[PDB]
């Protein structure tokens, strides 16, 4: 399953690359829907627990199911695909138990909610251009954590 | 299964009856733990959706597992058992599909958060003293909804 | 190699239970001495918290690791071989609980510690009887865990856990 | 290696955050200590303290405290509590990696005094550790005051 | 020379603590001696006792007892046991720093008598050391009583 999820994730990132701005907008709408569903503080708790080495699996499952409802009711294809990408990342974080993916997902949600689109485009640039995916993942997680700290400052 | 959950729930309510004040305090602590876990807005959304005839099962499942974690890490027996009572009610709502159970659970959590303990004592009195349990559930849900409206009027929700 | 460790830990346990069968009363006494050392080391409240968390479906691995290391210190400083080997048996069970993630092993370990502390030696003898006689070991574990939980509840009612 | 230096750097920055608001940080430390007690770690702290007073470092005790404090950081809703827990965890990690008994004694005595309600003693310990020029002599003086107050608390009530 | 004074004052305050409850302090001393035996130090104590009876001070034996008693203090859960160990450790350090054979004999003989169950002899030793005005003559009398009762124990 992990192999299938990784294949679909990168295939979704090729659609992202084709048109960044509309995909970022769709991610923002998905994050707004998550907030409307009552899941934002769930994301914040998941992020804090992950920063300290704890993976909140119930939080991940609730996020996955909420994203699936969003895909079911979204009229825009762009919104469905943004939701699908975030859901694939969440399922990967859940099944691999990898803390950096939990941090990446939660920080991406937080930064999208905060309006830091440039940080998300750069994170995706790190994930798609650098070949060493593990160190690209570490670099993007480092930038995400740094920028959420900056958002937390103001 | 539903029969066994009902058995443990009412047996838990007799333990409640033995000492109402400390049990309400423990329920307040459980709800504070729910809020700290990020689950309070989950309950509010579940409550609105139930008021409109929709059962948000992902919300219920997240609440159930959060209550289980609270039971796993609570040092007080009172806190563990209050959490267990709320979790049994949630499991009943999930397996029976009863919208009134979802409304009751969410409204009890909200009123506990609001400090309306007296309303919670009255809800429990209605469901355990009235003989016809379905009519007690209907009446308690009506009182819960009314008092949640009052809490929304005076403070925020 | 992880499973390799699991068979080695279970097999090393089986030899300890045959030695136990040879002289149950003295082995129970050694278990009481090990548990008294655990209490003196400050690990009893750790065991109680682990027990409650396991009863609610959570495995506290830091608690298990602290118990494993404490039991190893007991083996290092115990002058009686009986004490060292009782500690070794409990440590093998703890390592098994830790590597398999089996909640029933965590509950059994913690309840055995609590019952030994409470003086319920015959309950521990019956637990070992279930684990040694019943053919289906997985069903023996469930039966022993339910008996342990029941008797820990009785002890909590009569005397108090902490 | 060079991690002890990073732990000292992060600790000193955490003590600057402490200095910014003393009272709320002491409150967060008491909340962290209450969480330790709820986790079953208080008797561990007392045993570590007694062993350290006689020159013995209980390393399993330290590791259990480090891991418990990290779980507290993972589940604390207030950032102030998370950062108090992180400060105590950095001190524990330093005690573990340097083998310094005075750090073990300081950590355990601070936990005991916070549990006992001697917050002002902790404020004084932090004042000594942050104001004196010679950090090692400040550590010795702070440990001296901590030991005095834990012994006095044992004289009045219990431990 | 100043350390000898600091050890002596800490000893006198420990003996006032003993006086407050002699029976419980003797029980704690027996527990300390049992811990020494479990640590493998009892034959060390016996050889130290013989060597001191013949005018030889075994300093490695004394140091091993000092460090073992401190380990006992580090791991004892009872405060009184930690303090009995501390009293014996102060006495051992005094024997080591002064080179006094009577302190070596007294320490080893008290350990032996506690192990043998002669608690009352140790109570009398403490009474002699705390009542007699001339402390050196009190030490001589306590050593004579200790040697006499250890020899009596060895005969039977």
């Amino acid at each position: 399953k992990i192999e299938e999820l990784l294949k679909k994730a990168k295939e979704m990132l090729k659609k992202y690359a084709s048109n960044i701005d509309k995909f970022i907008a769709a991610l923002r709408r998905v994050v707004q829907a998550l907030y409307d569903a009552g899941a934002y503080q769930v994301v914040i708790r998941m992020y804090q627990a992950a920063l300290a080495g704890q993976i909140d699996r119930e939080h991940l499952r609730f996020l996955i199911e909420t994203l699936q409802r969003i895909m079911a009711n979204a009229p825009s294809e762009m919104t469905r695909m943004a939701a699908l990408l975030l859901r694939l990342l969440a399922l990967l974080a859940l099944l691999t138990g990898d803390l950096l993916l939990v941090i990446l997902l939660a920080a991406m949600i937080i930064l999208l909610f905060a309006g830091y689109g440039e940080v998300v485009v750069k994170i995706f640039k790190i994930i798609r251009e650098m070949p060493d995916k593990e160190e690209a993942l570490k670099k993007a997680v480092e930038l995400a954590i740094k920028m959420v700290e900056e958002f937390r400052k103001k």
Side-chain angles (χ1 to χ4, degrees), chain A:
Chain A
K1 256 279 192 173
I2 284 73
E3 49 276 8
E4 172 179 353
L5 301 172
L6 277 167
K7 174 86 177 177
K8 259 285 192 179
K10 282 183 179 297
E11 185 182 8
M12 201 60 47
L13 290 155
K14 185 262 297 177
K15 168 162 270 188
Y16 160 80
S18 55
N19 198 340
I20 301 297
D21 298 38
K22 293 187 64 171
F23 204 97
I24 295 296
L27 285 167
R28 304 280 301 275
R29 281 187 292 278
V30 172
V31 164
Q32 177 64 57
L34 291 177
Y35 179 91
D36 294 338
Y40 184 62
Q41 294 294 332
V42 172
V43 172
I44 288 165
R45 273 269 68 79
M46 198 189 23
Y47 175 76
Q48 294 294 157
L51 286 192
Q54 191 182 279
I55 173 173
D56 293 350
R57 301 180 61 242
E58 65 263 48
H59 295 63
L60 265 173
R61 289 192 217 93
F62 176 69
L63 197 65
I64 293 163
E65 302 178 35
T66 299
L67 288 165
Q68 185 182 322
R69 270 73 172 176
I70 294 168
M71 294 183 306
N73 306 290
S76 166
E77 184 188 7
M78 202 89 277
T79 57
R80 274 122 62 183
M81 297 292 109
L84 174 60
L85 170 68
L86 297 178
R87 185 198 189 212
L88 292 171
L89 166 59
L91 281 161
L92 270 177
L94 184 70
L95 289 185
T96 71
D98 197 338
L99 275 158
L100 301 160
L101 293 173
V102 184
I103 295 164
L104 184 74
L105 169 64
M108 283 195 31
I109 292 175
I110 294 168
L111 296 166
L112 287 164
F113 186 75
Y116 290 19
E118 295 85 357
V119 179
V120 177
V121 314
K122 182 61 174 188
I123 291 178
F124 279 143
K125 195 181 180 294
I126 299 169
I127 294 169
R128 66 177 180 271
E129 287 188 7
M130 288 187 47
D132 183 16
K133 293 314 174 207
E134 297 298 338
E135 188 73 27
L137 178 61
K138 291 181 161 91
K139 190 182 177 178
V141 165
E142 264 154 31
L143 169 69
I145 297 176
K146 175 191 170 173
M147 297 312 304
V148 311
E149 279 312 305
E150 298 213 350
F151 171 56
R152 172 183 191 280
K153 167 180 186 182
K154 305 182 73 174

